[PDB]
Design an enzyme around this catalytic site. Structure first.
Site, mmCIF file in Angstrom:
data_model
loop_
_atom_site.group_PDB
_atom_site.id
_atom_site.type_symbol
_atom_site.label_atom_id
_atom_site.label_comp_id
_atom_site.label_asym_id
_atom_site.label_seq_id
_atom_site.Cartn_x
_atom_site.Cartn_y
_atom_site.Cartn_z
ATOM 1 N N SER A 47 8.283 7.305 -2.521
ATOM 2 C CA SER A 47 8.815 6.478 -3.600
ATOM 3 C C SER A 47 8.889 7.203 -4.944
ATOM 4 C CB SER A 47 7.984 5.195 -3.755
ATOM 5 O OG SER A 47 8.038 4.389 -2.578
ATOM 6 N N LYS A 50 12.395 7.592 -6.257
ATOM 7 C CA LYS A 50 13.136 6.539 -6.953
ATOM 8 C C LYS A 50 13.563 7.020 -8.346
ATOM 9 C CE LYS A 50 11.560 2.471 -4.330
ATOM 10 N NZ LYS A 50 10.781 3.224 -3.320
ATOM 11 N N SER A 95 8.274 -0.720 -6.408
ATOM 12 C CA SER A 95 8.678 0.295 -5.441
ATOM 13 C C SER A 95 9.402 -0.343 -4.253
ATOM 14 C CB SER A 95 7.464 1.109 -4.994
ATOM 15 O OG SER A 95 7.897 2.296 -4.373
ATOM 16 N N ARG A 227 -4.958 7.071 -6.865
ATOM 17 C CA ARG A 227 -3.919 7.917 -7.444
ATOM 18 C C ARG A 227 -3.972 7.868 -8.962
ATOM 19 N NH1 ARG A 227 1.002 5.103 -4.463
ATOM 20 N NH2 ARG A 227 -0.220 3.376 -5.350
#
Ligand code: VBC
EC number: 3.5.2.6
Length: 242
Positions: A47, A50, A95, A227
């Site tokens: 993702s 994107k 997402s 993350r």
């Protein structure tokens, strides 16, 4: 120049995980990472793709602006926020893969391949299905390659209009307070080993910008919050944010 600081490895091991954080000090033109090798290892962007996909869709007129509504196709999917209408801002935020799969089909293989080469994006290889190659096709990008790409975006140097780049950077907005602004995109790659999480973007300060790109092993979705958490611990350690 590049500096390896293996002390950051603590932030990963303390959470029983492994990964890399790459930082770039724009004013000093200096990079820092815990692991020079993994910083240059190429993974599926998932993702994080994107960002380039939004840029291309906007510049070709596939997406008119950040207000255009992409209506839910009525197919119930396992991510609740995907089962609703979206615009570019909310599609980025949540997402929403199926919206971006439709972008890619409308972009088409030829224009997608050409634009990714113009962006110098990763291995520039769209081999696979045009509507899923960033999830299980041939495209690969490293953490240092994400930085290179993001720096061009920040400076409006990508080969798309200034408008397209401004709109995507708006859609990347993740956090803002009196101390800093973070524009970024998460990623989660599961279809090809090793399963990893991504977080790439930059931190805007009053007098400098710090670009960042991190990825980490992600055997289950339970560690996804790491993350951002690990990245912010590094930023705090380096006193980039309070
Ligand atoms: N099993 C699963 C869990 C979580 C997701 C998911 C959804 C939306 C965004 C993100 C992300 O990149 O943070 C991850 C997808 C599948």
């Amino acid at each position: 120049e590049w500096q390896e600081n293996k002390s950051w490895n603590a932030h990963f091991t303390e959470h029983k995980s492994q990964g890399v954080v790459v930082l770039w000090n724009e004013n000093k033109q200096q990079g820092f990472t815990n692991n020079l090798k993994r910083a240059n290892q190429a993974f599926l962007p998932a993702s994080t793709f994107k960002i380039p996909n939004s840029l291309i869709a906007l510049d070709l007129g596939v997406v008119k602006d950040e207000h255009q509504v992409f209506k839910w196709d009525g197919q119930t999917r396992d991510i609740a926020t995907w089962n609703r209408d979206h615009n570019l801002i909310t599609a980025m935020k949540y997402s929403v893969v199926p919206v971006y799969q439709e972008f890619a089909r409308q972009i088409g293989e030829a224009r997608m391949s050409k634009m990714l080469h113009a962006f110098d994006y990763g291995n520039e290889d769209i081999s696979g299905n045009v509507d899923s190659f960033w999830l299980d096709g041939g495209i690969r990008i490293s953490a240092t390659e994400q930085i290179s790409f993001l720096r061009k975006l920040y400076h409006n140097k990508l080969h798309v209009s200034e408008r397209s780049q401004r709109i995507v950077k708006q859609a990347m907005l993740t956090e803002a307070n009196g101390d800093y602004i973070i524009r970024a995109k998460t990623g989660y790659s599961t279809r090809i080993e090793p399963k990893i999480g991504w977080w790439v973007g930059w931190v805007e300060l009053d007098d400098n910008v710090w670009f960042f790109a991190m990825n980490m092993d992600m055997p289950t979705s339970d560690g996804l919050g790491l993350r951002q958490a690990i990245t912010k611990e590094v930023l705090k350690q380096e006193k980039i944010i309070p």
